[PDB]
Amino acid sequence: EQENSYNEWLRAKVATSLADPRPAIPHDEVERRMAERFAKMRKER
Amino acid sequence: HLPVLWLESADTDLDDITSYIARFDIDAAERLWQRLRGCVLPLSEHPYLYPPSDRVPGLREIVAHPNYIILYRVTTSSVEVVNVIHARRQFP
Structure with a gap:
């Protein structure tokens, strides 16, 4: 019964992801934001 | 080579997952990102x-x-990363 809630939550999550009007992003850019995020996290220590 | 792309939802998952871990372990958060990017x-x-x-x-x-x-x-035209999810929890 816990697998049915997980699958329903996941299908709804993907359905939301596929309804997003914003265009897909090159891996290039995600590497840049991840780098931006870890740097700001370390400056906060 | 086929271009690798990311949905914003996937980026947001990436940001959410690594944010929660980093509140307790920044290196554990980076190791998880180095693994995801390597896949x-x-x-x-x-x-x-x-x-x-x-x-x-x-x-x-x-x-x-x-x-x-x-x-x-x-x-x-490409491969799109749709979401990055926890395997056992409804997260993020």
């Missing part, structure tokens, strides 16, 4: 390497970590 980058050369998902038809499932899964699909 998605070679998709340019092996787009259909991972099996199709039975939970979400039309997507393919990478078990990058015992606790985290990458869901992607191959389009007419």
Whole structure:
């Protein structure tokens, strides 16, 4: 019964992801934001 | 080589997952990102390497970590990372 809630939550999550009007992003850019995020996290220590 | 792309939802998952871990371990958060990126980058050369998902038809499932899964699909022009999810929790 816990697998049915997980699958329903996941299908709804993907359905939301596929309804997003914003265009897909090159891996290039995600590497840049991840780098931006870890740097700001370390400056906060 | 086929271009690897990310849905904003996938980027947001990435940000959410690594944010929660970093509140307790920044290096554990980076190691998880180094693993996820190392699963998605070679998709340019092996787009259909991972099996199709039975939970979400039309997507393919990478078990990058015992606790985290990458869901992607191959389009007419690219491979798109759709979401990055926890394998056992409804997260993020």
